[PDB]
A paper describes a structure:
To probe the roles of Glu318, His319 and Asp352, we conducted site-directed mutagenesis to convert each residue independently to Ala. The E318A and H319A mutants of CpHpsN suffered 580-fold and 240-fold reductions in (kcat/KM)app values, respectively, which was mainly due to a reduction in kappcat values. The 3D structure of the ‘closed’ CpHpsN H319A·Zn2+·NADH·R-DHPS complex displays a productive geometry with the primary hydroxyl carbon of DHPS positioned 3.3 Å away from C4 of the nicotinamide group. In this complex, the Zn and R-DHPS sites are not fully occupied, and the final coordinates are modelled with the occupancy of 0.7, whereas the cofactor NADH has a full occupancy. The partial occupancy of zinc presumably arises due to incomplete reconstitution during purification. However, the concentration of R-DHPS used during crystallization was in excess (>100×) and is not a limiting factor. This observation therefore suggests that zinc is essential for ligand binding in the active site.
Author numbering:
A (entry chain B), B (entry chain A): 2 to 436
């Protein structure tokens, strides 16, 4: 295992800056509520307008959105919705018998209110807007509040707004960043605090969601976008290089990783990536140049197993696999947000319209979670019921363990049932706690 | 809706104290690592022994655990495992065709390393020990690190230790509180950082997990225990009262709630609870007296619908239902951690040996999450693969949407595939970005 390109910075590098800003802003917002948010909206995003859009404003701001644009977004919404409904079917309710007379089961219930964030800064994240909202509706969530940042010194990008509306948002707000996340968490402006807040964003957005976990549920830590490509000698260096640059344009902090067993592939890609970046237009060129320099990495490995080991350690948001024997890679990789098998599909496809959600774990979160999905909006709750007969065993065990732990009042709830249901039975219910 | 008893305190009252302590302690542990943890163990828990238990120590400390105790714990481990294995079956892998030629699927994979906390302070939480570890093993997790607080002069309570060992823990540490949670998160002492940290504890433990979310996944915010009872005129006040007192003994901060449509039931319960508490031994009496006084509430409602409304808003960790027509309540209740239908079962049974997990959401977390389960250790990841033909539709939509967003490099990954796979095709790929 050898690093042909090592990065100066990682997803961890900017953590402290993000956490500093978020701690300050959240303190302010907790203390000063809506006034703090309007002021942050003013000073950060130059926004003095109304925050909650009326139906009139939405209609007005999207009236001129062309039919061909709407057709593309509607098509994407359908793909996302279809995959979401398939995922919903994968998680089932059930009941079982355990000890005789003990019935237990699992209920699967949607949350009531979701807040969805769609980012807008360098780019306007049209696709993010339907990724959150369409998924929440597919999960059967009753109320969906959606926010996106005022873009390029104006309001919500009209195509983001269209995405939100067509995906089924009930409330739309022109709010960005930390103040958006906090507003949705606390129910500022709407009076409807979210049960779950979802959606991608820069390091401040992702840290704000992470800090507010508890107050709300979340999808996943979904910060500056990442990409890894696993490639063997069959891979096409021109396509690999193209794919790396594709995510590098997200911004200065987006890492692009190449893991390969072919030095010839690595070398060609390392030559091609700067060339591809130089041909980009200004904003993308600016982002990708910094990202590739500071965060880009290339790792040469000797075997497939070493690639797997490295990939799993990196736990990339998105992982492309351009190799032979794709079944082996599906069977063996274990840590990634979203997997793209073979050359034909690619991350940008997943980003816009493949179907599976693009809101995905960054900064190692793929070690413990997949991305936004209907699963993040379903609660899996347990229920149980017993016969009186079942409590003969369950009760005596409960009383004895409870007493071993020191929990006398717990044990008495079992004693009381035994005395009531079976006044003639006599069991070892454990030595009463005296201290 | 009338408050026959209104609480002066709620689960939210103590949040500020918890956060202050946790912020300080986590800062110290980030700064000083193992040195801070050894210092906290000495100063908070009076422990200056080794932290990681050796195989010989475990054998030696569990050698005189009687056969009767072992049989009860083993029976409980069986019930938890049985229900866990059933829950595991409820979440399926799948693949589907979306747009023709687009294959997308869901992989369900266990995390690599889990940290389990079993509390020990007022009481020694034997059941908590198997709740975490047995569930992790049922999920297929290969490495389980297990911690419990030094209890009453010694290291880990011997019965907690037996539970950890019999449930299948790989590493066991004598370590409590925030320092335990932190150590498992950062892999201190073991060199094995957890992917997910689970387990219940006091307000500091729960806040530490919440604050470390991101570094690790977690189960849920599982702080000071809560109980709610729904009762109608059919309920037995002696049992209801016993059950409320059962959970109140957990500590000064444990809320016990009664929601009822019967005033007579309410009055008898309110008379009984004090009498029952007075009959408890000192530790439990002290805890329950304060909990009932400060946090206990009793609410009278006119209709079942009002009871559901109020129950859903309280979102209790554990919810007993002593009513007629239990199917209606199962159909209509939406916010609770774990549901106990009918009088026969009770929270204490679920705590020790019913089967469903007892590590459950507090402080309103049941609005967005169920308790600890195999689901908290299973990652739901997505994969996809495409034919070249599929990329004709998917690629053109990607390129157009990308360019609408301003993301030119994204669009170029589609352009490059269209040129390679279909050089003679002419699609609208969008106006290239110039800015
Ligand atoms: N992980 C995932 O699934 C996805 C991640 N992303 C990432 O989302 C990010 C989007 O970033 P942006 O374009 O900035 O949009 P954004 O919407 O995340 O950020 C814009 C907001 O952040 C605020 N902000 C910016 N700098 C600030 C500062 N220093 N202090 C306080 N507030 C500040 C702005 O005022 C505005 O309110 C990119 O890094 C992109 O890669 C995008 C899509 C999916
Ligand atoms: N929600 C759930 O599913 C469950 C909740 N529980 C709850 O767990 C709790 C256990 O509480 P404890 O007996 O305290 O056990 P614990 O193990 O949670 O707390 C003991 C540890 O906390 C530390 N600690 C205590 N006070 C501290 C302070 N002021 N500053 C710093 N560290 C401090 C101690 O030094 C020790 O390391 C109870 O409230 C119980 O109701 C128990 C089982 C299940
Ligand atoms: O490009 S998008 O903003 O649509 C999604 C992003 O690539 C995933 O991090
Ligand atoms: O009593 S236990 O500590 O075993 C579980 C507790 O009641 C759940 O909050
Ligand atoms: Zn992207
Ligand atoms: Zn209990």
């Amino acid at each position: 295992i050898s690093y042909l390109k090592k990065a100066e910075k990682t997803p961890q590098t900017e953590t402290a800056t993000a956490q500093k800003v978020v701690t300050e802003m959240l303190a302010e917002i907790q203390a000063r509520g809506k006034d703090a948010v309007r002021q942050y909206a003013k000073q950060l995003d130059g926004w003095s307008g109304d925050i909650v859009l009326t139906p009139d404003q939405i209609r007005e701001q999207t009236k001129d959105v062309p039919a061909g644009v709407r057709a593309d977004i509607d098509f994407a919404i359908r793909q996302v919705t279809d995959f979401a409904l398939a995922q919903r079917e994968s998680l089932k309710e059930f009941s079982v018998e355990l000890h005789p007379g003990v019935t237990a089961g699992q209920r699967v219930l949607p949350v009531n209110v979701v807040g969805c964030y769609a980012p807008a800064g360098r780019y306007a994240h049209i696709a993010s807007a339907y990724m959150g909202v369409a998924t929440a509706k597919a999960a059967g969530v009753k109320t969906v509040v959606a926010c996106s940042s005022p873009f390029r010194g104006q309001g919500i990008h009209p195509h983001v707004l269209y995405a939100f509306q067509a995906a089924g948002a009930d409330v739309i707000m022109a709010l960005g960043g930390v103040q958006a996340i906090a507003s949705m968490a606390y129910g500022l402006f709407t009076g409807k605090p979210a049960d779950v807040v979802v959606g991608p964003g820069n390091k401040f957005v992702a840290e704000a969601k992470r800090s507010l976990y508890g107050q709300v549920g979340i999808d996943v830590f979904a910060g500056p976008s990442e990409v890894a490509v696993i490639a063997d000698e069959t891979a096409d260096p021109a396509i690999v290089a193209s794919d790396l640059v594709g995510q590098a344009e997200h911004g200065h902090e987006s890492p692009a990783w190449l893991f390969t067993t072919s030095r010839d592939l690595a070398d060609r890609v390392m030559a091609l990536v700067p060339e591809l970046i130089a041909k980009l237009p200004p904003t993308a060129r600016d982002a990708a140049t910094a990202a590739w320099r500071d965060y880009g990495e290339v790792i040469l490995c000797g075997t497939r197993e070493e690639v797997v080991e490295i990939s799993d350690r990196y736990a990339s948001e998105a992982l492309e696999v351009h190799t032979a024997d794709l079944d082996w890679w599906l069977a063996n990789l274990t840590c990634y947000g979203s997997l793209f098998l073979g050359e034909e599909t690619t991350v940008a496809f997943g980003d816009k319209t493949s179907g599976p959600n693009h809101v995905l774990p960054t900064k190692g979160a793929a070690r413990y979670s997949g991305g936004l999905s209907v699963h993040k909006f379903m609660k899996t709750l347990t229920w149980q019921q017993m016969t009186r007969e079942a409590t003969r065993q369950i009760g005596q065990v409960t009383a004895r363990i409870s007493r071993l732990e020191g929990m006398e009042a717990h044990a008495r709830t079992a004693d009381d049932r035994m005395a009531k249901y079976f006044p003639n039975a006599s069991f070892e219910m454990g030595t009463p706690v005296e201290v």
